[PDB]
Amino acid sequence: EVEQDPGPLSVPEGAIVSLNCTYSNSAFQYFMWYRQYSRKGPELLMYNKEDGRFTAQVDKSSKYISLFIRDSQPSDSATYLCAMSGLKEDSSYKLIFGSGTRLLVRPDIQNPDPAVYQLRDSKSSDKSVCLFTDFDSQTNVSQSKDSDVYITDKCVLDMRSMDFKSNSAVAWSNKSDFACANAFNNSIIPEDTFFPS
Amino acid sequence: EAQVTQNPRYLITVTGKKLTVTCSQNMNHEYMSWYRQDPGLGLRQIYYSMNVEVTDKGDVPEGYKVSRKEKRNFPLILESPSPNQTSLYFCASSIQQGADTQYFGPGTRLTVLEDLKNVFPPEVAVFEPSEAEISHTQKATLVCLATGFYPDHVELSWWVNGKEVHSGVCTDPQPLKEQPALNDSRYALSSRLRVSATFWQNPRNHFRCQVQFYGLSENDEWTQDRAKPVTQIVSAEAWGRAD
């Protein structure tokens, strides 16, 4: 049996992160880390000592496993699973996985320009959405907790060839009183947020 | 380097109707294993097979059986699916039961429903960039919304001039419920694609938000008035604008 904290652990890009697990079985002698993106299949990361930005370590006396990620990047954001088993000289040595820790690395937004823009449907309908965008990663987007208004959480996109990342969230509603002006009233947003006319 | 495949990758079934999910690997590995993954519980092993004609219960076998007639395959069989078997299943293979790399398949998402009345494909709409964003930033963000679908079995992608794009995209990691006040709320999911103003401005550029929905199969019986919610793609599109 393996104990692992679920997180999520949120850190700023460039920070060192430490992920760890504790186990109770002294026959465990092989220790690896797996990384799982979104809902995709886990894939081995470390089974080692150091590997570039990664160092895996084990203290068998403390029964404590750790993975350190130096200079962390938004692309490290994933679930990390510690895996372990006995030796192959053992009668049974089935690999087991801890239940994973979710890591979010917050992108460093170098020039925030928070704004709420209204976008209209391409097809027509009187339908529109409200896009809050370009805010720094300190910003939290709240679910407004009104049943007829829908608000996504923040999501970071990367325009690789501009060396530009930006956060955004989307809100929409059918309530006749809904307007981009009020859409994110349930969140704390920068006073300088731009509401075009 | 090769791989583990699972079939199907998505499946809806009514309670009590038998189904099997295949897992196959072409590496001649002796050891294969089935797990489920559920929120809060991580991977839990259902059953494992050390070699051809050798199978063994794992930690959560109830409701499942397997077989291992050949090295290539290790199917998971649910004789009488129950709702709490709704889950994400992963097959894995390795040269041996441990102290060695396990290779995982891509996952099979299974939803087991009381009936199929609440299954619905997405509707899809593309919202065009704000002229205010273009003038303020010299960039242009399109938003796609997929709405009304259930269960949450979708894959959203963007296609610019007929080719898939990944740069400048981000899609919500999970949908939200549209009518969380009702049972079996249909779901909505949003994604953004951001391009330069120059690129959006060209009327020859064509942008499509494509949602693959995995729904009922040919064989599933359908008796509601509306079109059967089969596996299908639903898209919406926008062209660039000089504006």
Numbering used by the authors:
A (entry chain A): 3 to 49, 55 to 204
B (entry chain B): 1 to 243
From the reporting publication:
To assess ligand-induced conformational changes in the TCRs, we determined the structures of 12-6 and 1a2 in unbound form to 2.36 and 1.83 Å resolution, respectively (TCR 38-10 did not crystallize). Ligand-induced conformational changes were also observed in the CDR3 loops of 1a2. CDR3β underwent a rearrangement (r.m.s.d. in α-carbon positions of 1.8 Å for residues 96–102) that resulted in formation of four hydrogen bonds and 33 van der Waals contacts with P7 Arg and P8 His at the critical C-terminus of p53R175H. CDR3α experienced a considerably larger movement (r.m.s.d. of 5.5 Å in α-carbon positions for residues 93–102), with CDR3α Glu96 undergoing an α-carbon displacement of 11.5 Å. This rearrangement allowed CDR3α to form a β-hairpin whose tip engages the HLA-A2 α1 helix and p53R175H, thereby optimizing TCR interactions with both MHC and peptide.
